Design an enzyme around this catalytic site. Sequence first.
Site, PDB file in Angstrom:
ATOM      1  N   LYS A   1       1.039  -1.607   0.079  1.00  0.00           N
ATOM      2  CA  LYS A   1       0.106   0.066  -0.369  1.00  0.00           C
ATOM      3  C   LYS A   1       1.277   0.917  -0.039  1.00  0.00           C
ATOM      4  CG  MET A   2       4.793   2.082   0.335  1.00  0.00           C
ATOM      5  SD  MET A   2       6.159   2.392   2.356  1.00  0.00           S
ATOM      6  CE  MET A   2       5.898   3.922   3.025  1.00  0.00           C
TER       7      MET A   2
ATOM      8  CB  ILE B   1       1.131   6.418   2.293  1.00  0.00           C
ATOM      9  CG1 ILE B   1       0.892   7.836   2.135  1.00  0.00           C
ATOM     10  CG2 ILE B   1       2.211   6.618   3.419  1.00  0.00           C
ATOM     11  CD1 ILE B   1       0.089   8.588   3.541  1.00  0.00           C
ATOM     12  CB  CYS B   2      -0.824   3.955  -2.174  1.00  0.00           C
ATOM     13  SG  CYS B   2       0.150   3.282  -3.294  1.00  0.00           S
ATOM     14  CG  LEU B   3      -4.099  10.102  -0.324  1.00  0.00           C
ATOM     15  CD1 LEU B   3      -6.125   9.154  -0.014  1.00  0.00           C
ATOM     16  CD2 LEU B   3      -3.939   9.839   1.197  1.00  0.00           C
TER      17      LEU B   3
END
Length: 164
Positions: free
Chosen positions: A109-110, A116-118
């Site tokens: 998740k990055m 960071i994967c929003l």
Amino acid sequence: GMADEATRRVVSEIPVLKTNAGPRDRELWVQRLKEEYQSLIRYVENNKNADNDWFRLESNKEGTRWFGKCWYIHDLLKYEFDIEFDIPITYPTTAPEIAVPELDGKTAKMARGGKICLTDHAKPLWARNVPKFGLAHLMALGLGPWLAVEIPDLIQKGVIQHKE
């Protein structure tokens, strides 16, 4: 309905921002930065009263580069991570990508560089609110929840460890 109440509960006491300006917008950018610092510091002060003081942020002179630390407490152990991001030129329409470089490649998740994967839900929520949300909102709605999912998962997988 439930989504609005969820957002209002999380950000209700964070000062709303006003000025639609990015890094190159001269006196409007200086005014945007006043709003950004006003929102961040009220957020921290609120975090302290709630025994949830979980980050420090600072910018360079121009406010184009932000850096600081976030803390996450898990089973009474405090984890500290250095954070940094660049303000996009098209800010605040475009959300910045918070990087936690020390966690780079340690979760899916990055993106590359520990950006960071929003979530697919958070980006349009930002989009609908422009220019009312600032960095305080990005921390509350973006990194805050991300830490509460990924830090526990990483400690459990044994990939992250505790320092004194």
